Amino acid sequence: KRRKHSWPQPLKGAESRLWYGGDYNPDQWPEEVWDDDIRLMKKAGVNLVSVGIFSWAKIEPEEGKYDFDWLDRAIDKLGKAGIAVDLASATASPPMWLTQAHPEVLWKDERGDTVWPGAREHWRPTSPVFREYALNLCRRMAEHYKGNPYVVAWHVSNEYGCHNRFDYSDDAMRAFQKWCKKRYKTIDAVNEAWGTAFWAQHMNDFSEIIPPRYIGDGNFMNPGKLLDYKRFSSDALKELYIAERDVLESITPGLPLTTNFMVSAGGSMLDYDDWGAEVDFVSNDHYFTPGEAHFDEVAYAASLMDGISRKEPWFQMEHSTSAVNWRPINYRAEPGSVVRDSLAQVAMGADAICYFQWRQSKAGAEKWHSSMVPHAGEDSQIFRDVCELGADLGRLSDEGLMGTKTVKSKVAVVFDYESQWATEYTANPTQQVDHWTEPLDWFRALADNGITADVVPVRSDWDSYEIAVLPCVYLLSEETSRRVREFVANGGKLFVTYYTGLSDENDHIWLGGYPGSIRDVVGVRVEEFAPMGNDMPGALDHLDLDNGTVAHDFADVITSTADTSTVLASYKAERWTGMNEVPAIVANGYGDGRTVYVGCRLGRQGLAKSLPAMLGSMGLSDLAGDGRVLRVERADSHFEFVFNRTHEPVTVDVEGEAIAASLAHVDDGRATIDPTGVVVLRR
Amino acid sequence: KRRKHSWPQPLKGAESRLWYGGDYNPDQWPEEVWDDDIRLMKKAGVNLVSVGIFSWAKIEPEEGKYDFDWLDRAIDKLGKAGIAVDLASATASPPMWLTQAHPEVLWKDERGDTVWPGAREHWRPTSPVFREYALNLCRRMAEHYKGNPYVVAWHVSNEYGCHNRFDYSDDAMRAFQKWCKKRYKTIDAVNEAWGTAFWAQHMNDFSEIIPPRYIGDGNFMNPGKLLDYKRFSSDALKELYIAERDVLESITPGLPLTTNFMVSAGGSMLDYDDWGAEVDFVSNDHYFTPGEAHFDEVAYAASLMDGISRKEPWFQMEHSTSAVNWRPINYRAEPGSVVRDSLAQVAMGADAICYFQWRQSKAGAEKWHSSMVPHAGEDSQIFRDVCELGADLGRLSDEGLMGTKTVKSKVAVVFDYESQWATEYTANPTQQVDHWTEPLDWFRALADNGITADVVPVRSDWDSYEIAVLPCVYLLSEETSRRVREFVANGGKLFVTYYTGLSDENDHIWLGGYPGSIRDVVGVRVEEFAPMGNDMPGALDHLDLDNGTVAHDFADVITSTADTSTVLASYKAERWTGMNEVPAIVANGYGDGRTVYVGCRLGRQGLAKSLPAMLGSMGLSDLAGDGRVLRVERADAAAASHFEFVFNRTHEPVTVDVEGEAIAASLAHVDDGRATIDPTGVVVLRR
DSSP: OOOOOOOOOOOTTOOOOOEEEEEEOGGGSOGGGHHHHHHHHHHHTOOEEEEOTTOHHHHSSBTTBOOOHHHHHHHHHHHHTTOEEEEEOSTTSOOHHHHHHOGGGSOBOTTOOBOOSSSSOOSOTTOHHHHHHHHHHHHHHHHHHTTOTTEEEEEOSSSTTTTTSOOOSHHHHHHHHHHHHHHHSSHHHHHHHTTTTGGGOOOSSGGGOOOSOOOOTTOOOOHHHHHHHHHHHHHHHHHHHHHHHHHHHHHSTTSOEEOEEOOOTTOOSSOHHHHGGGSSSOEEEOOOOOSTTHHHHHHHHHHHHHHHTTTSOEEEEEOOSSOOSSSSBOOOOOTTHHHHHHHHHHHTTEEEEEESOSBOOSSSTTTTSOOSBOTTOSSSHHHHHHHHHHHHHHHHHHTTOTTOEEOOOSEEEEEOHHHHHHHTOTTSSOTTOOTTHHHHHHHHHHHHTTOOOEEEETTSSGGGSSEEEEOSOOBOOHHHHHHHHHHHHTTOEEEEETTSSSBOTTSOBOOSSBSTTTHHHHTEEEEEEOOOOSSSTTSOOOEEETTSOEEEEEEEEEEEEOTTOEEEEEEEOOGGGTOTTOEEEEEEEETTEEEEEEOEEOHHHHHHHHHHHHHHHTTOTTSOOOTTEEEEEEEOOEEEEEEEOSSSOEEEEOOSEEEEEEEEEEETTEEEEEEEEEEEEEO | OOOOOOOOOOGGGOOOOOEEEEEEOGGGSOHHHHHHHHHHHHHHTOOEEEEOTTOHHHHSSBTTBOOOHHHHHHHHHHHHTTOEEEEEOSTTSOOHHHHHHOGGGSOBOTTOOBOOSSSSOOSOTTOHHHHHHHHHHHHHHHHHHTTOTTEEEEEOSSSTTTTTSOOOSHHHHHHHHHHHHHHHSSHHHHHHHHTTTGGGOOOSSGGGOOOOOOOOTTOOOOHHHHHHHHHHHHHHHHHHHHHHHHHHHHHSTTSOEEOEEOOSTTOOSSOHHHHGGGSSSOEEEOOOOSSTTHHHHHHHHHHHHHHHTTTSOEEEEEOOSSOOSSSSSOOOOOTTHHHHHHHHHHHTTEEEEEESOSBOOSSSTTTTSOOSBOTTOSSSHHHHHHHHHHHHHHHHHHTTOTTOEEOOOSEEEEEOHHHHHHHTOTTSSBTTOOTTHHHHHHHHHHHHTTOOOEEEETTSSGGGSSEEEEOSOOBOOHHHHHHHHHHHHTTOEEEEETTOSOBOTTSOBOOSSBSTTTHHHHTEEEEEEEEOOSSSTTSOOOEEETTSOEEEEEEEEEEEEOTTEEEEEEEEOOGGGSOTTOEEEEEEEETTEEEEEEOEEOHHHHHHHHHHHHHHHTTOGGGOOOTTEEEEEEEOGGGOSEEEEEEEOSSSOEEEEOOSEEEEEEEEEEETTEEEEEEEEEEEEEO
């Protein structure tokens, strides 16, 4: 069911190398400028660029008229310079002539208001009119470029669902109704799934399924329907991508196809693990979070990408050299980030490193988004760094890094797109809790304890690891619940947190005490929750634990533990709160395995501090190591990538021959690595 | 180009006195109250009121039916009492019969939702049918009141664009299409200006230009288009005002016309410098900012008005005696504000002082807005201050203040409405930075150093000043860039800050290092920005400078400086940030001039502390002074006679040296050349 892995191949006369480059948009610059791009690209070690992504209005400037010459010239200029082309379908966003002639392609928001042109991606995922136009352009691009010697892959569309994830038009309403019929078969199944006995929502047939349109601010949508609308929206965009991909493939067999994902700790527009089955190689867009989380979350996202790709080499389609344009405050990246963040992505399995974008735009909505050639030009620290990185990727290529894979960790941290979606409902126990923050917190706390985890999607093989973490995995089906029992019974070591296994996949609650489907594995029983916050005078805002850590946002009221369990920590609180001496962290044995249940949100800091005790109870005291650096390994040969995780230079022992270094010095088996520094070793 | 300055003239062709009064709405009160109004106006020294401003529904109660008699009688009563009338066109807001009959006049928001009656100004600036109705009323008003001996000016409409600056209806679509054709001539030029090669936005003809309508929350409009839509929206309202002005004038030639602007530090609904060319006298509405900025920003805004009026006497059409109605918390003004804020406006060149409004409303949306006669009545501190101020304006009139002009400062602080509009785009380096805060910060910091600046619109003559400041002037066209270059080369002393000259007039980036069009003038090169804030844990929220100030919000990463420059200050920071020892304040010599580049936001306090060293580098240490007070002077041509206005800027009484004869004082006194001024106090001297 997964497509066979197929990676973009070198140009004639060229050898196999790490791909390096970024989005390139010659149609935004006078043709005169292109020769300068080629000169700077060669200087930087660029060998691949992605072209034509938003070029629909240039390629088809009016309906039924096509203009390829400019693009043929650009591609030829790149190719004869030894730079390969990842060619877009150009179907990311339609021209004004198209939308003026066919306003029915525009998506509608919850209130039924039309979303107009003015920005990008303003089209309905289920519009048959838009699909027709897109497939036409796909056919004509593929027919024109099928003989081109410089094209090495297809970049289908761009970031499906970045702006048009949700549509509430009648096209969407009809498509959702059909999607529900496919999923549930009978209207009574839908009624039971969504619990429509409540609030007189019973439906007599599929015409009575309407999308989660506007219901008045502050009012509460049917949560089953809302969750399914997210599943449906991801499937709808997926079916369109499949159609475009198949048209391109029909005309250019043997050219690998991808589309760019938006995988980040807090990004959940689509079920990207599901989508990963539909590409020839998985590719990602990731932009750093400014501040204290910058490095760790870059590493985390790249690890999840390696999980999505099932440890096959994957493609970093976009990231930024420094500031983006779209945040309330676009902080710059710390000096060193260009090489460092990129080599983190390589460490986590990327065999291609690309940026948005090659040359910083001088006009338009993204002119303030950093690029490889800044507004300042080639005399810039960023461009010097871009050049250093290209040379580094060349050296890693000479060393044969291509095709190696990131080693299997002893620990898997589970991520679940659908659980994230379930946690987004507005009448959960607290709207402060999303699934997504917990696996990040665990990844980081494990790293503080010198352990590099793999981030593994819930449908993938986390139960083949020695140790795994279920961090706020809100949904657990009976099937997943069974995988959990067997994982532990067979000798696995499993961490489980609050907000795990509250409901099944239809968001029906597992009754009898939380977590209702696996409470006998973890040996705790929760009767009630105690959310915390600062929005109510005198309400509970934190809970100290007796192990020197502090819970925030959420705590389980654990009222019994198994006779096989050990309480590792308990809350301390004023008596009237009822939370004093309630168990907070509980260890258990079950079959041949061990669990630790963490009944509250402890964050990176509290988890990191609690980990020695928790690992101890599991028989894993020997696992901990040096948390000042992250150590990431690829192997077919072993390559170790070592990153300073702190704000001060650190010295650590390193084995092997240093083959790359940025802001770091290796001498006599020891590396002094500056903040934002990295060393790469081979042996 | 500019209209010849024409000032409202006194009743009976007598002496031109300082005008004093406010908005007057007899149609809101039973007629017995009108006689009470007259008694109290006389006691207060009121000599001018503005009437009929929102009276459309009373004057034209049904289509083509007119009821003038109440207004005729009110104007007669006023004039016989010696009180002049500033007559409105009454076209500010339409009656229910009009909007009920013609829903198509109502403006539409970005989502296409109709904005209904229920408040005011709910009409599309480019509606042809509303224009027909407005011009008809203008004509009927002018024909009826022509030759009235008590009417001294026209108050055209009211605050254009206060509520209807933006319309997204099809009338606006058509008008914006024509406006783009006028500006750019060809669709190729529009495409080039807006950089439409990006995101497949290329347009084949002018029918493919649509207004910046709803694109979904959190999405990014074409910034060239958004900026031009603000230009267009200002121009569209200006064209309507010009049409109303022209009809009125064609019927009552010689009667001076104005419309009331909304000039304040943070106000930018329209390009008010552009609009200033279209009125016979420039008039403003300004309402104090509660808290620590109160006095300084009153002074600033009035200075900017004097800039817009090119130093011609101007008209304070509205302000508040105390609290307004429209803030989340309507703080009252400090006692003394009635006289003090009004005399600050006079000091900055106003020959008329008026309030919204004469009598506090007992009903309606603005009943909680303070007024000259409070709900409390004539027995109130506010009415007593109102009477004191009227008496003071009488005394200043006796001393011949009218017609003098605010003296030219040694420093011009530059303000650019269009730069403010550009900084409003939502995908800039940081959305915390607006152009408008910086010129205010510099004005206050200069005042802290005993210097009263002129606030000067960018198209005006700042390059004729000894010293000028470009404070976050985000846009610099080629033309303005040349003026900067010549200004410095010829001996001008120039301050330039971060967020200046990033782009040309169509928001195209000047390439090669910021500020891309004048980096050789200031002798610095910026490769990237280091914005700062408190919204991301662990990101920088500040940078200490090595001169004992602290930057917030934004810092330039200066990576080189010219051979002729001198670093006056640099950042101190943790090494990992990359900002340690990066230059923060850099002086340069360029031709016979001097510059200082300030690459970060230092605020009033940091700028005030840094100014002595900065001025020093320009060769100007002697420009210092006592910042406890603001001194503002007016003078006649020949600079024969001088008037000095002195304001306490602090919270304790101050005593300062003053030359000349005291002619007015509030919460203050002058004795043998020493002015003792209480907080919120003011003295006025004649030399």
